[PDB]
Design a protein around this ligand. Structure first.
Ligand SMILES: [Zn+2]
Ligand SMILES: [Zn+2]
Length: 51
């Protein structure tokens, strides 16, 4: 099966459960562990469910 997946831009792990996305940039995603690191500082990240 070949499918589109959401991959964490902080650690390359799967983004499952809560998905953090940049409020400004398209195609930016963090898992909940990496969001706690504060990555992509300067842009607010938004909490969403994951696909
Ligand atoms: Zn991560
Ligand atoms: Zn951004």
């Amino acid at each position: 099966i070949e499918e589109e997946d959401v991959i964490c831009d902080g650690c390359n792990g799967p983004v499952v459960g809560t998905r953090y996305k940049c409020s400004v940039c398209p195609d930016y995603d963090l898992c909940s562990v990496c969001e706690g690191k504060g990555l992509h500082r300067g842009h607010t990240k938004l909490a969403f469910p994951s696909p």
